[model samples]
Target: MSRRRVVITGMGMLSPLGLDVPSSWEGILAGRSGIAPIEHMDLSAYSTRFGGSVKGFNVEEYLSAKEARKLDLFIQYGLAASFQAVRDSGLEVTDANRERIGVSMGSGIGGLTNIENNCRSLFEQGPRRISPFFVPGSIINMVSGFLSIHLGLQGPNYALTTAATTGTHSIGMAARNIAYGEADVMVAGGSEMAACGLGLGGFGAARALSTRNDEPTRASRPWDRDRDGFVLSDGSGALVLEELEHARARGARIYAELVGFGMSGDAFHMTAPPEDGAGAARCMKNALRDAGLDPRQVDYINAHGTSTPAGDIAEIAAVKSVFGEHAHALSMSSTKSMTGHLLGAAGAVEAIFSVLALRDQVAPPTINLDNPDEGCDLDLVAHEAKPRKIDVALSNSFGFGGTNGTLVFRRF
Candidate 1:
């Protein structure tokens, strides 16, 4: 039998640029950088003092004050995005279909702020001061757990934590669950809030963040000659993926068809891909093979392009090896220049952008790439959004531990 088909019904995002998807997409197309000096945290002594902090988000809108207080900001963001997606998709959960729906939300660095706060409480005030809700509030899987509790979804609720590939794998595995008949609808995505002191110091200690504190807006220049490293960011992205027939039966607005998903691991390093990006190439190849499409059919790509010096070059090399002649023809760009690197949330957010690119027939721009690096010759759609015929778009996400994932979206 033919594999069951899946399609995107709705999407939602909370990024550094804006609290929702439209504003974020607008900022991306306008080449606006959301990376700025993080005023909410004390980063005075840190090497990379700036980050992509989500702006003007009021948690009470989605959750009660008591509900919001017990959960970490990451879970709050995930739940907010999930609420937006479910509302956007018009998926009403009656008692009949509640068990047929599920959630697969996760985080890369879950509850860092919570852990930090609890640790301080432990050290300063001893054990009696610790909050009773610490573990449930801080765990990575609580996003899905809370989502299910709020929405009454009971089918296959779970989470995935694959470093930066958390969102991609969550979404990809959600699709697999639907295709394999495990569920009819899967709410999937990732969220992160790594702007706290520990998050900043940890990424800085890893030497994975850019130190261009002078120009925070221009800090995340992927594939640019001046690019140093990725700007750590906080955000969340959620999508409603449903079986194609189920969506049609309910008359849901189909954004795009999720044709294929591919995942791989480099096995080379804990925090870096090889210079050649062989694992990335294999990931894309697997996605294309799954989609049964030629390399030339892919009209655009939303790159993982985290702006790290080595990663930027390696992804280009991987694209060239996989796409060959078509690599030059396809327009590829990194939305991270505007949104910063949202870590685990990057894949779902970029996947939403990919779907929007197909819907609008335009490719988002790679801002701050005033001077493209030597090997970054592909038409990255740098500096400005480009109108193009985007029938098929691929979104790539490569994580620290050599984990890589690619999602193929066909214009619906």
Candidate 2:
């Protein structure tokens, strides 16, 4: 028996650039940088002072005041994105199909802000002062739980926490569930809200954040010779994935077909990737093999270029290894140069951009790539968006512990 086909019916995003998909895609095409000074907390004691924070987000838009107060920001972000996706897909949860719907939302550092604040409260005001909702609000799986409750989705629901690969893995696994006849529709994505003090201080201690405080917008300069580190961001991205026939029967506006998903482990390092890009190369090859497509079929790539010295070069090397001569022909760009690193949410957001690239036939730019470092010679689509015929697009997400994921999207 053949597996069911899965396609993306809708997409939503809450990012540093904008609150919804249209504005975020516009910001991406305009090459706008969303990284700026940390707004929610004082950075006096921290080495890295800037990040990509969602600006002007009003929780009232998606949840009641009481509901908002009971949930962590991560869950709030995920729920908001899911709302947009469900609405966009025109999926109504009736008695007939409610049990066939599911959710697979995740976060990399779920409720970090909640954990930090609650810990401080416990230290200063004792356990009695801790809020009763603290535990439920701060867990990694709450996004999926709360979304299932809100959306009345009664099928499989779970969350994955694979560092930065969380979003891609969640989406890939959700698609597999639908393809395997486990569910008719699956709401999948990731959210992150690790912009608080402890989160920033922890990553700062790990030397994973850029300290270019003087020029916040230029801090996330992927592939640049002067690049330093990734700019941590808070954001969420959600997608409505359905069985191809189910979506077509409902007349859903299909964005793209999720043709392939591949994951791999470097097993080489805890936090650092091997310099030769062997693992990432294998990951991309696996995705291509799953899609049953040659490297030449891919027209664009949304790179996992985090502006870190080693990572940028390694990803470029991996592209070369996987695509060979086709690497130079395919337009690859890093939206992270504009949106900063959304950690676990990075993959889903970039995956949405890849789908948009296929729909619009344009590749978003790798802004702040003024001076490409050595070995980054492929068409980076630097500084500005490029108009191109994008038939198949690939989005890559590699995370800490050498976890890597790649997703292939094709025009529907």
Candidate 3:
């Protein structure tokens, strides 16, 4: 028997750029930079003083104050995004269909703030001061659990925490469950809010964040010779995916078809990709094969260009290796140049951007590509968004531990 088809019916996002999909997508198209100085905490003692912090987010917008207090910020963000997606999709979770709907959301560093606070309470105020909600709020899979209960989804429920690839993996795995007849509808994506002191200090201690303290907006310059490191960010992105026939039967609007999902591991490093880009190349190849597509069919790529010195060139190498002659013709850009890296949520956010690219027939820009370094030869779609005939687009997400995931979306 043939596998079922999956289609994206709705998308929601909370990012450094904006609160919802329209605002975030507009900011991206305008080449607006959302990176700014950190405001939630004092960064006076830290070398990296800036990041992509989400602004104007209030948990009360989606949940009651008492309910919101029980959950961590990461879970709050996930629930908010999921609310938007479900509403946008017009998916009614009734008794007739509740069992057929599910959730698969994840986080990279789930509830880091909750864990830190609970630890502090235990250490400084004694064990009795620890909140009873600590474990439930801090665990990575709690986002999925909470969303399932709130949305009344009773099908396959899970979360993927594969570092930066968490969102993409979650979406991919949800699609598989739907296509394999396990569910009819899935709320899938990732969320993260690790902008606290411990989060910043941890990445900083690992030398993984950019320390251009004087220039926060220009810190994430992908493919630039002066590029240093990724800018940490906090946000959530969610998508409502449904099987094709089910979507059509319900008169749902289809954004794009979830045609391909590919995953691989570098198997060579923990924090850095191999210089040869072999693993990344194979990952894209596998995605293309899964889609039954040729290299020339891909019109644009939302690259995994985190603005790090080595990662940018490594992904470029992978693209060139995979696309060969078509590499130069295809336009690729890193929205991270504007929104910074949203860690676990990056993949889902970029996947939504890819779908919007197909919907609008325009490719967003790589904002700070003032000067491209050697080996970054392709058209980087710098400075401004460009009009294009994007039939198929690929979003790449390579996480820590050498894990990589790619999602291919096509115009519906």
Judging by lDDT, tell me the better candidate of 1 and 2: 1
Predicted candidate 3 versus true structure: per-residue lDDT over 132-232, tens digit per residue:
88888788888889888887778888989999999999999899999999999999999999998899999999999999988999999999999999999
| lDDT for 384 (candidate 2) | 92
* lDDT tens per residue, model 2, 1-412: 4888889998999999999999999999999999888877888999998888888989898889989999999999999898889999999899999888999999998998888888899999999888899999889899899888888889999999999999999999999999889999999999999998888888999998889999999999999999999999989999999999998887888999998989999999898899988899999999998888899999999999999999999999999999999998999999999999999899989999999999999999999988999988999999999999999999999999999999999988
Prediction 2 global C-alpha lDDT = 0.92
Off by over 4 Å in 2: none
Model 1 accuracy (lDDT, Cα): 0.93
Can you list the residue pairs that collide in candidate 3?
A: none
* Candidate-wise lDDT, in order: 0.93, 0.92, 0.92
RMSD of each: 0.8, 0.8, 0.8
Query: Could you tell me which residue pairs clash in candidate 1?
Result: none
